[PDB]
Assembly symmetry: D2
Homo-oligomer: 123 residues x 4
Amino acid sequence: AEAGITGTWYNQLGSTFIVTAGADGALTGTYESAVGNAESRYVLTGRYDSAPATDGSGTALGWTVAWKNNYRNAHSATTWSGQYVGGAEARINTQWLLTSGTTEANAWKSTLVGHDTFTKVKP
Amino acid sequence: AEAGITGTWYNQLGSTFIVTAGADGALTGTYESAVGNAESRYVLTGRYDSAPATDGSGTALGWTVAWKNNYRNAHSATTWSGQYVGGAEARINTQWLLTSGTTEANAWKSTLVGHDTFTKVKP
Amino acid sequence: AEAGITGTWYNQLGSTFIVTAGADGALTGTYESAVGNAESRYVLTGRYDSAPATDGSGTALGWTVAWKNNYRNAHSATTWSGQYVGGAEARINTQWLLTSGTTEANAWKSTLVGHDTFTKVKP
Amino acid sequence: AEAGITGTWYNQLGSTFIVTAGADGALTGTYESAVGNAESRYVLTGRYDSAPATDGSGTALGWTVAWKNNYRNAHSATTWSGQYVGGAEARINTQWLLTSGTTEANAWKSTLVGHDTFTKVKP
Ligand SMILES: N=C1N[C@H]2[C@H](CS[C@H]2CCCCC(=O)O)N1
Ligand SMILES: N=C1N[C@H]2[C@H](CS[C@H]2CCCCC(=O)O)N1
Ligand SMILES: N=C1N[C@H]2[C@H](CS[C@H]2CCCCC(=O)O)N1
Ligand SMILES: N=C1N[C@H]2[C@H](CS[C@H]2CCCCC(=O)O)N1
């Protein structure tokens, strides 16, 4: 975990993020887009639960990216929840929620759900 | 948003969190439990997309809480994704994902999904 | 469960559905819209797991509605997953997934997630 | 869609289901387990929205399986929501919700979320 989490990660779509896993569960870094209504780099911040593991379990973690930077303001934010598995083929398996700001009437359709798997090699 | 986000929030279950919405989209604070395998206060970190809004839309945001502090280590983390609506009865409507670290075999059952609504009054 | 499930149900939004819980776990009925890109009545089909319960537990169930009838063809379908709780104030608490048919490129944004609570009184 | 949906489907985990897509949006069949607290065959029922598509879009559909048969009664049900894509390598990409009957206190942790991709070849 932590040291093994620090570094560059890539998903299938092409998205990339660089993260630093701090000693006390913090995750800080940048996400750079590859395919959605995101463009460029965005700040990412999250947390991980280190014990984490005498039974080769994953390390739970999560992070958020608000889709606003100096070139785009998408009025939305995504949170990824999942776990880190280390080793030869270490990976972070996640499920995500993307919420867009809507009026009260359209609030029911404000959140999309999906999944992403990140690896240290692309892809 | 931001100023209106800063403060104390409560949900139905009894959970409470205090957050500070920083000038550049940051959200930092503490979450104090009321009903799950959480006990005490945990650090919370997230982001919000301010434009946010000439059509009374919500401000999208998200945050993460790793369930580890000096009294408990639950080996899990939760991410809340949703939007802030201000006014007389301001609220944050969210959907959450809670992932627990599991072995590869039990990974398919590692994530729970739910929702939470927070208000400035309890409840 | 079953007998207690059979009948008319209403949610907050105004949606209504009438269902018959058959002896062998089947759920058949119609859903009539109140607020989304649905209009009129649609066929609903699902299943419930009766044991269901010496510890006042809910009865798990789920159903699907394809948003196509003689007046509208929304190219989408919603599934509701949740449980039935009976009694004075019986209810069905659910979480739903709504998928729209998209091209491969937009598949990542094809599914919305939300929740609905149904009661026997409106609302 | 429909004809192309009828047949046998397999996912990564090993699960298999045979379905018949009826003329008027119905989906009926059986799901046979491979890895969860399911054992044997279970009845599956769902619906699909045929228009479905002058822009090679998927056909939205969904189905439910209550995990009860003559050998097991898991007190739970799963709903899969997704779309069918046909062709050389036709597939059904889905996201699922699995709800277990719980007492009111544990209702917040009653639903798991995940995804499954089914193909006509295993896997
Ligand atoms: N790696 C991923 N990219 C898309 C999904 C969830 S977040 C999303 C990109 C969204 C960009 C902003 C937007 O489209 O509003 N996963
Ligand atoms: N306010 C909420 N509390 C429960 C749900 C999602 S997070 C959860 C508390 C989890 C505590 C840690 C655990 O049980 O592992 N919403
Ligand atoms: N009772 C509910 N109505 C909306 C949500 C999920 S299903 C949805 C109505 C969708 C209608 C069809 C469409 O908009 O495409 N819950
Ligand atoms: N193909 C899949 N199998 C597991 C996930 C969601 S449904 C699940 C099997 C559950 C069996 C019943 C149970 O464990 O309670 N996808």
